């Protein structure tokens, strides 16, 4: 569930970047050398959040995979390996 909750949150942050990227492109349609660096700042800021979340997610996912694998039952070994 926590991994599922994380992916829900990942979409929201990706969406925030998509909207920032959209506006950066709109601003260039109007002013080619503007598109305020503040937007690039926000873009990069939300990317830092994705990356932080990405890594945190991956570590939790690893633990989840490891727990499936070492609990016993070939199905969990197969599932865990398939998540790598």
């Amino acid at each position: 569930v926590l991994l599922l909750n994380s992916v829900y949150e990942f979409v929201k942050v990706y969406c925030n970047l998509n909207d920032i990227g959209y506006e950066i492109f709109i601003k260039m349609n109007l002013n080619d050398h503007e598109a305020s660096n503040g937007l690039l700042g926000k873009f990069n800021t939300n990317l830092k959040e994705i990356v932080s979340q990405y890594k945190n997610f991956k570590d939790r996912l690893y633990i989840f995979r490891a727990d499936l694998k070492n609990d016993g039952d070939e199905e969990l070994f197969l599932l865990s390996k398939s998540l790598r």
């Binding site: 990317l47 990356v51 990405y54 890594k55 199905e75 197969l78 390996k81 398939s82 790598r84």
Partner: protein
């Protein structure tokens, strides 16, 4: 999500493929060659969904969601006659009478440009009929000139006119290393447009398709018109879940969301295990292993230390998951993925149509699949080598102004140069992706 799909045939190649597609599709849905349901109305329950491919009217006639374009009325007419009563004649379009060859890409591009209004009006008329439209199936067949030219111009018009609709292109490369003197023209310019505008594409090799058709349908009488059945069935494998849905995909969007890690690298390489179509019934275990075997590839890719990327298949038939998981484990050991990647491998449901002939499920070896691999680049390179010589020398560069003003406006050098950068970037991106450090620009951007 899924929605209706419109097939667009830009030339004879696609229009011939259409015989194979509409026959096989109608076959699977119990639709006759006259467009009518083949089922008696004594049984009305159905569990398929023909809506995305056919309009079903009050006479239970199924009208294909397709528009056929050509410069030669005969190929479309052949289809209309073969399937008389199946197709709506208003979806037939033909370019003003004329002819071109080699430079036919330029000519294609011109007939597209000159008639975008007429072709787009036909496309909008079909789309306007329904609400939930989701994408197009484009038969581009890059080797053809007017086919590719028209397809290139229509692709540009459609990707911006319909930005929300997924454009999937089916394109087969030339079987001849000598015709490339002009087919490399068609290829560099057509490939530019595919790279810039398409959302997805499947790349095929006529040399491999012809060889396989002859090997599987064991017979020396090898033809493009025999081979097109393989194309029809790779398409039917892909749409299996849409037409005969279950719970796994049933959407172009869904599969691409899982199968294409980057819109930059959306050129997929298909393969198959033996199937019947319009004794080797091996276990799904073996099917999976056989599907990544180089001998089953519809693209000659060499497969020398195969260059990984996202793998997806369908096993057609009712098969047991334990075999699937065992085979998948073995496949995971056989095919590598970059460490930056998710190393995803997926298997679809493969449900068979209820209107097909009976066979034991333990013998359902059949299936066709695609891999996202950099082993597509080697195909692009054979053109590339051919076109890095004719444009460099200027061979035929003085013979391409076939109505599109290629030479009239001296776009000759610019079309090559811009297209050349675009095709090189695709190849470079496929290759850059081969390294573990590919994502460092975002993941170690501390």
């Amino acid at each position: 999500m899924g929605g209706e799909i419109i097939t667009l045939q830009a030339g004879q190649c696609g229009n011939h493929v259409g015989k194979f597609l509409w026959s096989q599709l109608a076959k699977e849905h119990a639709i006759g060659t006259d467009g009518l349901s083949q089922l008696p109305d004594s049984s009305t329950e159905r569990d398929d969904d023909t809506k995305p491919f056919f309009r079903e009217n009050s006479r239970n006639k199924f009208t294909p969601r397709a528009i056929m374009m050509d410069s030669e009325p005969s190929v479309i007419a052949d289809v209309e006659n073969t399937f008389r009563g199946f197709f709506d004649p208003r979806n037939t379009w033909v370019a003003s009478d004329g002819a071109s060859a080699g430079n036919s890409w330029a000519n294609g591009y011109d007939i597209g440009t000159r008639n975008q209004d007429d072709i787009l009006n036909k496309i909008d008329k079909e789309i306007d009929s329904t609400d939930n439209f989701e994408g197009f199936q484009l038969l581009h067949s890059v080797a053809g000139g007017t086919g590719s030219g028209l397809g290139s111009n229509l692709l540009e018009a459609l990707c911006d006119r319909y930005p929300k609709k997924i454009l999937t292109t089916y394109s087969v490369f030339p079987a001849r290393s000598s015709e490339v003197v002009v087919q490399s023209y068609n290829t560099i310019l057509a490939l530019r447009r595919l790279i810039e505008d398409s959302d997805a594409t499947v790349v095929f090799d006529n040399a491999s398709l012809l060889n396989i058709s002859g090997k599987v349908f064991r017979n020396p009488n090898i033809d493009l018109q025999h081979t097109n059945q393989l194309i029809s069935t790779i398409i039917s494998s892909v749409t299996n879940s849409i037409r005969f849905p279950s719970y796994m995909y049933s959407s172009m969007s869904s599969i691409y969301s899982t199968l294409i890690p980057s819109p930059e690298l959306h050129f997929l390489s298909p393969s198959f295990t033996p199937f019947t179509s319009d004794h080797k019934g091996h276990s799904s275990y073996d099917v999976m292993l056989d599907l990544l075997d180089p001998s089953n590839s519809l693209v000659s890719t060499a497969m020398n230390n195969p260059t990984y990327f996202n793998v997806y298949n369908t096993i057609i038939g009712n098969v047991e998951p334990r075999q699937i998981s065992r085979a998948m484990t073995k496949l995971q050991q056989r095919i590598k993925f970059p460490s930056w990647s998710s190393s995803a491998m997926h298997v679809n449901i493969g449900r068979r149509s209820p209107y097909l002939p009976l066979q034991p499920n333990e013998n359902e070896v059949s299936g066709m699949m695609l891999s996202n691999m950099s082993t597509v680049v080697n195909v692009f390179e054979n053109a590339c080598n051919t076109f890095d010589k004719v444009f460099a020398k200027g061979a035929f560069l003085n013979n391409y102004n076939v109505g599109d003003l290629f030479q009239s406006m001296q776009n000759v050098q610019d079309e090559f140069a811009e297209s050349r950068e675009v095709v090189q970037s695709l190849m470079e991106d496929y290759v850059a992706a081969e390294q573990d450090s590919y994502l460092d620009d975002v993941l170690v951007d501390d």
